[PDB]
Each structure stands twice: as structure tokens, then as C-alpha cells.
């Protein structure tokens, strides 16, 4: 049903926030979390202060779990600022658990808050974090450094074995949200980096993407602008 929806560009503000939000819930379980988290963050902002309130609550609660699924580490400011921090408190616990890299705290929280999560529709997404607990912790360590031992990853993160940590990193680079190549000779995990991106198209490609995105705003604006004054002319304006 989501795929069939073209969902028009000229739609009310509440419509925009709600569609992105549903599409995000659907994508999150799927292992399309990069896209889900962007629409869900957007959805919260876009939703009003009055009519939106029931659904609105639900977007902020679900989104915190969804962002973790990508490997984002959500801030404290996010919890404090709408002033919902109390209701958000359990999700906050998952945020800590994901970061540390140790499974025992993540499994315990999942079952205990299990009933509460199911309402909001989070529970299906909570169980997916078990891959993510480890992923988020290996992700900070692989990107930051160049060649680091599987042995460093395992001591810090509290993983079972370096060998265990070696399979886990392998699977992630296949998913491509940590992007690396592993050399299990000496036994390090190696970062991808070219130390010049000018030789490659990437600064150009980045700019070019914006140019398409920008052009879409111009075409959308020319058509939209005349429509309300036109409507008023036939109906007669005082």
C-alpha cells in the first residue's frame, strides 16, 4: 500500500508528517533504517501542536529505537526538549545499552518493558537491536582509527571473542554501513579512505544531487504560486 501511494506534493502539513512516519515504521524492521530514521525525525518536526498529539507521541517514542537501528547514538537534548522525558525513559535505557556494546543489558530491558513497547508498536523493532548493540560500538571504533585489532574491539565493547568480533564486522561490511575491508593476517580491521576525494567524482556528485533536489523546488513553486488567486477570481473577491 505504501509503494502504491504517490502521495501528492500539494498536501496539508499533518498529511506530510503522518505519511513519512508510517513509511518509517515499515522500513525500520526491513533493515532500511538509514531512510526510516530521516523520515521519522522529519515527521516529528512537521507534526502540529494540537490535532497531531496522539500520533505525535507515538512518533517520538518509536523514532528513538529506529535511530539506534541505524547506529545513531541519540542525544540527551532530544529527550529533554519536547518535555516528554519521563515517557521516553525506557528508550533512554536502550540508547545506553546500544552504545556500550554488551548484549546482557539490551536483552534484559527488551523483555521487562516488553508489554509497554508492544502498544506503541516498537516491540518488533526492539528485538532487531541485538545486531545493532554490537554494530554501533564496532562502528565508532572502525571509523575513528585506521588499522585496529579485533582484540581492541572485543576488550572495549565487551564481546566474547576477537573471533566472534571478526565474524560480526564481516557481516556489517556486507551490509555497508560501516564500510571496511578486514585483513586477518596480522589481524586488523582496515578503514577505507583515499585522502583526496577531488580525483574521484564525489564532491561533484554531492553538488549535482543538490542541483536535482533544488530544480524540483523551482518546478513545484511556479505551478503552486498562481493557484489560490485564480480560484478567488472566479468566486469574486472583496
Amino acid at each position: 500500500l505504501v509503494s502504491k501511494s504517490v502521495f501528492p506534493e500539494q498536501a496539508n502539513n499533518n498529511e506530510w508528517a503522518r505519511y513519512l512516519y508510517y513509511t518509517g515504521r515499515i522500513k525500520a524492521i526491513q533493515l532500511e533504517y538509514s531512510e526510516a530514521r530521516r523520515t521519522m525525525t522529519n515527521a516529528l518536526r512537521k507534526a502540529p501542536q494540537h490535532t497531531a498529539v496522539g500520533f505525535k507521541q507515538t512518533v517520538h517514542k518509536l523514532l528513538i529505537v529506529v535511530e539506534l537501528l541505524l547506529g545513531e547514538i541519540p542525544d540527551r537534548l532530544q529527550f529533554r526538549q519536547p518535555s516528554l522525558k519521563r515517557s521516553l525513559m525506557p528508550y533512554f535505557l536502550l540508547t545506553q545499552a546500544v552504545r556500550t556494546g554488551n548484549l546482557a543489558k539490551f536483552n534484559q530491558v527488551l523483555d521487562q518493558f516488553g508489554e509497554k513497547f508492544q502498544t506503541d508498536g516498537t516491540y518488533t523493532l526492539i528485538i532487531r537491536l541485538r545486531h545493532n548493540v554490537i554494530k554501533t560500538g564496532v562502528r565508532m571504533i572502525s571509523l575513528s582509527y585506521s588499522r585496529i585489532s579485533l582484540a581492541d574491539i572485543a576488550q572495549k565493547l565487551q564481546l566474547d571473542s576477537p573471533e566472534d568480533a571478526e565474524f560480526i564486522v564481516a557481516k556489517a561490511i556486507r551490509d555497508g554501513v560501516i564500510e571496511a575491508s578486514i585483513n586477518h593476517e596480522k589481524g586488523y580491521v582496515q578503514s577505507k579512505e583515499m585522502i583526496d576525494i577531488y580525483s574521484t567524482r564525489e564532491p561533484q556528485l554531492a553538488f549535482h544531487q543538490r542541483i536535482s533536489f533544488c530544480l524540483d523546488i523551482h518546478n513545484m513553486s511556479v505551478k503552486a504560486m498562481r493557484f489560490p488567486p485564480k480560484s478567488y477570481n472566479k468566486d469574486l473577491e472583496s
Partner: peptide
């Protein structure tokens, strides 16, 4: 969330004096 750096303050000052000798 909260920065691990704070907890690090007390621990980092002390480490410095010992470490220099311990390791080259």
C-alpha cells in the same frame, strides 16, 4: 547522551604523571 569526558577528568590528570615513565 552524557559525555564520557567528565568521568575522564579525574582519571586523565593522574594517569599522565605515571605513564610517561611506564611506557616510552
Amino acid at each position: 547522551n552524557v559525555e564520557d569526558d567528565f568521568s575522564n577528568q579525574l582519571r586523565a590528570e593522574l594517569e599522565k604523571h605515571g605513564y610517561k615513565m611506564e611506557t616510552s
